Design a protein around this nucleic acid. Sequence first.
DNA 1: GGGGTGTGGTAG
DNA 2: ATCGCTACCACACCCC
Length: 438
Amino acid sequence: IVACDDPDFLTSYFAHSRLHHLSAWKANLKDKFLNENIHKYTKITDKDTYIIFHIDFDCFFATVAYLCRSSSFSACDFKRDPIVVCHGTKNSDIASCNYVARSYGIKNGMWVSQAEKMLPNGIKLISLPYTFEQFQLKSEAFYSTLKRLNIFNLILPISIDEAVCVRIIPDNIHNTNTLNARLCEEIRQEIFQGTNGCTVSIGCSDSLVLARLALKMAKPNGYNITFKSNLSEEFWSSFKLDDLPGVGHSTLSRLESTFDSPHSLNDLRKRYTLDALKASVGSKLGMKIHLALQGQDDEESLKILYDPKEVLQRKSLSIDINWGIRFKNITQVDLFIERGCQYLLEKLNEINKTTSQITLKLMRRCKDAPIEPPKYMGMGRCDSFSRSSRLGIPTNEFGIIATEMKSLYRTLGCPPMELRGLALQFNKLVDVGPDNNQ
DNA sequence: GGGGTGTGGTAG
DNA sequence: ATCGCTACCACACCCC
Ligand SMILES: Nc1ccn([C@@H]2O[C@H](COP(=O)(O)OP(=O)(O)OP(=O)(O)O)[C@@H](O)[C@H]2O)c(=O)n1
Ligand SMILES: [Ca+2]
Ligand SMILES: [Ca+2]
């Protein structure tokens, strides 16, 4: 057991945190794309007509954890048992659940306690541990397979288990659904063989947004080809409002209040007006949704195709720790901040950059919230506070950055015992060139 | 027109 | 028990 005032805390927390792993994996995939394309002119141009193959592992962690499960779980049956991946037994996040579990209403991100209550009597939830290294190994096989097939002009990493793959179609060639179905089946089979049993689904379209929706439609373990010319009421009727990219719970709530609780993208499509949309959810998001309901990408989303180097370049660096934060005094807080600064500066030096601006963000227990919340070591209900500072001279000096971070904490006034979370951010990064003469 | 801040949301 | 991360866009409200 490692407490937050123990020097090993950051290492142990990050070693256990699937959300840390996900961000670290995504960051590494981005750096790798940039390094492998340092000299290639890697970008779709306006001259190209393209097809999007949006490819994603089905129940990634659950699939891999099951395939690599220990002897204690040998008799577990992936097609018949409800399976989740999590650390704990009660207020522990379900990071992944298989589709048997989803058939009972279980969803990623539920707590185990919640998920158990959805099972009929006699049916047992199987909980598998995380297998972080094997998650990474399976992803390696995935990305290696995509490259080996030599059918994509551009392979864009989205995450450990997801990529957007672009095929340019010369319009001396005649693309067909049959050719695209063959490609989907090739991809699916080769990844199945290369991952030793993981399944991917695939959405295939002529827009990013349609490929994403097609992917949702294809799951589990299938593919869906829906081009703009194929659109129909049957298609839009199949989606919830938050299936749209950019629509989370808060945008969901807003659209439901504004448009009389639409229950499908078809409902929304028939009811909205661009102007009422913008008023509900904002100008840019409103325009994005409008275009999405036409099967069309917005300018911002298209940047990944036309300048992936820029989109995938990292522009800030941070850590967030909002679990296990229980400090008795300001000395221990300050030492934790210093440990976080050290960790961040290692990351900053690995990419050979300096920072010109930093931010400290904290979570403070709400005045009326229990000191020990429902989730063990959780942040519980908090108020958030943030403050930033320009450094003037770009720097990677620990002395300067750590002192300023600790000062930022001081200015926010949070008593150490009330602290429940901390985020440390380098907001602006500056390249380090060969010329460092003042 | 240019600049800034803290906050909020979504992704994956 | 249990590991509630992190990047980046968008916005509302300030300055000139
Ligand atoms: N609340 C959540 C939701 C997602 N995940 C993780 O985020 C990654 C991507 O999840 P996603 O693709 O959205 O879901 P899958 O579990 O792969 O299921 P599916 O794609 O078939 O819907 C997976 O490693 C998953 O474990 C998580 O840790 N916490
Ligand atoms: Ca997935
Ligand atoms: Ca994914």
